[PDB]
Amino acid sequence: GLGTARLQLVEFSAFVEPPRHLFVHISQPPLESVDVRQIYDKFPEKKGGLRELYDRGPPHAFFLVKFWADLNWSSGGFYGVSSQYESLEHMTLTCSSKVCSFGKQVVEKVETERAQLEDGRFVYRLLRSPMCEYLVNFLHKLRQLPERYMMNSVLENFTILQVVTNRDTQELLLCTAYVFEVSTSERGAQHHIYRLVRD
Numbered sequence: 001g002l003g004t005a006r007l008q009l010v011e012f013s014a015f016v017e018p019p020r021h022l023f024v025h026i027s028q029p030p031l032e033s034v035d036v037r038q039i040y041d042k043f044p045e046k047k048g049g050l051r052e053l054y055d056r057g058p059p060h061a062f063f064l065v066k067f068w069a070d071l072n073w074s075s076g077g078f079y080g081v082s083s084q085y086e087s088l089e090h091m092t093l094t095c096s097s098k099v100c101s102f103g104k105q106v107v108e109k110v111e112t113e114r115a116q117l118e119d120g121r122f123v124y125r126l127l128r129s130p131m132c133e134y135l136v137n138f139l140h141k142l143r144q145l146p147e148r149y150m151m152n153s154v155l156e157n158f159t160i161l162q163v164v165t166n167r168d169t170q171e172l173l174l175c176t177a178y179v180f181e182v183s184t185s186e187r188g189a190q191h192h193i194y195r196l197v198r199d
């Protein structure tokens, strides 16, 4: 799973409507591990970078998701992001999304979501969230590249860092690093979740 004893990711998708096609999707063998030092360079060595955050800890909060996104779908159309987390504790969440292009942070989006009681547990729904202009434009350019290897080339410099903290205590609950390639249309979107380690 992508989660800890305290907070667990349930579903994550990015999509276009318009007024659904999913570019990437996580619905929910231990879990392979990746040494965080390998991806230090795909994120800023600045405040709120992978290096900085991992140093505070707890190490078990950190995950890598590699995405093979489906970009086969011209101008619409509702572009959106949906996340759903769950816990057994009642919290409010502060979710920070940092989009990075060549190590540098080009976008940060901070959102807050309160626990909702449902089915003997707390669910945190951040559904139908507008995709920022930057991502829409970027996707619209990327879909036009003639070769999937050129999308892969363009994507090797593009990463997202998602930091979920307990809004009242400032403790870190979940830190997911995203890295990207493209999938074909017959293979469909795919992902591989990893745990980040250092030892």
Ligand SMILES: CS(=O)(=O)NCCc1c[nH]c2ccc(OCc3ccccc3)cc12
Pocket (backbone or CB within 6 Å): 014, 023, 024, 069, 081, 097, 099, 108, 109, 129, 130, 131, 132, 135, 160, 162, 178, 180
């Ligand atoms: C909520 S926000 O708009 O403020 N920022 C977005 C937050 C976000 C976290 N993880 C993601 C994974 C993928 C994605 O777009 C799909 C996709 C992107 C790039 C190439 C191919 C496909 C957006 C996100």
